[PDB]
Structure formats: C-alpha cells, structure tokens
C-alpha cells in the first residue's frame, strides 16, 4: 500500500476540487477519521478505513457551503429576473388570470415512464374572466360538479390523452368551448 492522501493533504485546500461528484465515502480520500457504529461494551465506535456503513451513508461531502457558493457563482449566469408583478395574489391574478397544473414525478432507475405524471388541471376565476352573467348561469349549469361556492375557482381536470402538451391543449380547448357554448344562447332557455 501507500501512505494515504488523508495525511498527505494539508489545510487551506479546495474541497470542490477534491470531490466534484456525488461519490461514496472513500475514507482514504476523506481527511476525517469518521467512526461509525454501536461500540462494544469496553470499546470505541469502529474505525474509518473499512466501514460498510460509512459507504452506505448518502455521503453529503461533495456539497459544502463554499461549494454551493462558488458553484452558484458559476450558475449565476443562467437566470433572468421577475417583472413588477408584485407579491400580491390579486395583482398577479389580474395580470395573468388562468392557473394550470402540470407536474412531473421523478423516479430513479432505468425508465422515466410515470403515466400519472401527465395529469393536468386548470383553475380559472370568473371574477377575472369578467364577461359572464347569464353566461355564468349557463356555465354553472354546465359544470355543476365543480365550482365550489366559497371561492370563485373553476377546476377542469384532464387525464384522457397521453401527452402533457395535448393535456394542456385539452384544458385550454375546454375553457374556450365552454366559454363559447355558455355564450351561445339556446332556444329552450326560457322554459326553465
């Protein structure tokens, strides 16, 4: 063997240079005598050089606060900033009415096929749509099962088509054709 780099290294060295990647422990690389385990009755926690449990630990050594700081000095390029849309929820609702739900479910393995990850659902405000009176009456009568009374939120779900973008298309299509059929006056409305 060789006298290891654990005592070859000295102070004032760059741990982002030492550990770039998420890696298992490697106690020879680690300059820290980490002791793991339930000790024996007249003994110490067992040593550093051969610890299966220290290799089993998720090992957040590669992410130290100076590594976050320098790394995001590198990442500070990849960002713009927000406009003055304000922290106010009514302000951002006025600026941008509709709210669409489209998420992802990240697994870990060979395949990235989580089908439920295509679920999409749209919430819109009638007080921000602003253009429905007997159209809003007809609208509620169309979608009875949604639109709870306490908050003026319309929630339309789609899980009918495999792709997330055409699920978004289904959502916006239902919004516009519910709107158009609500504004389409029918001949049997008066005999209510």
């Amino acid at each position: 063997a060789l006298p290891p780099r654990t005592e070859k290294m000295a102070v004032d060295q760059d741990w982002p240079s030492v550990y770039p990647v998420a890696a298992p422990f490697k106690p020879s690389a680690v300059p820290l005598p980490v002791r793991m385990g339930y000790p024996v009755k007249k003994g110490v926690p067992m040593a550093k050089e051969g610890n299966l449990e220290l290799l089993k630990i998720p090992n957040f050594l590669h992410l130290t606060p100076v590594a976050i700081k320098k790394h995001c000095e590198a990442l500070k390029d990849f960002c713009t900033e927000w406009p003055a849309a304000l922290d106010s929820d009514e302000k951002c609702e006025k600026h941008f009415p509709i709210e669409i739900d489209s998420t992802d479910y990240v697994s870990s393995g060979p395949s990235v096929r989580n089908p439920r990850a295509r679920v999409v659902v749209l919430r819109v405000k009638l007080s921000s749509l602003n253009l429905d009176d007997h159209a809003k009456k007809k609208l509620i009568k169309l979608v009875g099962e949604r639109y709870c009374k306490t908050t003026d939120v319309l929630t339309i779900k789609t899980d009918r088509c495999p792709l997330r973008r055409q699920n978004y298309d289904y959502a916006v299509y239902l919004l516009t054709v519910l709107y158009h059929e609500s504004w389409n006056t029918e001949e049997w409305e008066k005999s209510k």
Binding site: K141, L142, R160, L174, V177, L178, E181, W188, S191, K192
Partner: protein
Amino acid sequence: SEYAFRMSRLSARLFGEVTRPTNSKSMKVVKLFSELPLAKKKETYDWYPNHHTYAELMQTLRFLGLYRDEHQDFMDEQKRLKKLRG
C-alpha cells in the same frame, strides 16, 4: 326534470362521454374500452423475469471461466463422484 336531462346530455356531448341515455350494462363496455385489460398490464406480462437470458448467460459466462458459481461446482463434484461409484 327534462331540462336537467338535456343539460346532462349537452355536458356529455361537450366533454366527450356518451351522449344518449345508456345504462350501466353498457357503461361497463365504455369503461372496458376506457381501460387496458388485465392481460395488457405491464406488470402482468413482465411479472416473471424470462430467466433464459439470466440462466443461459450465467451458464455461458461460467463456462467462459469469467464466472465462478459454487452451487454448480458443488453439483459437478457430487455428480463426478456419482458417476464414479453409482
């Protein structure tokens, strides 16, 4: 009433389910065509590992000598003694 039934029909036509009034004994059919069957399930047809690639690849790689399987070594020695005396 009749207005409620035709609002249900209009909502059905607008959303994509069955428009005309139809009972549960064909809503079973529309749900059957709405789902995959229990035989097309990925877990159903990939429940078992096929075991041929596994067992035959290990047979080949041991006989290559890049794999050492102690179970097969044990039966090899045992069957050598069996052909020796039996």
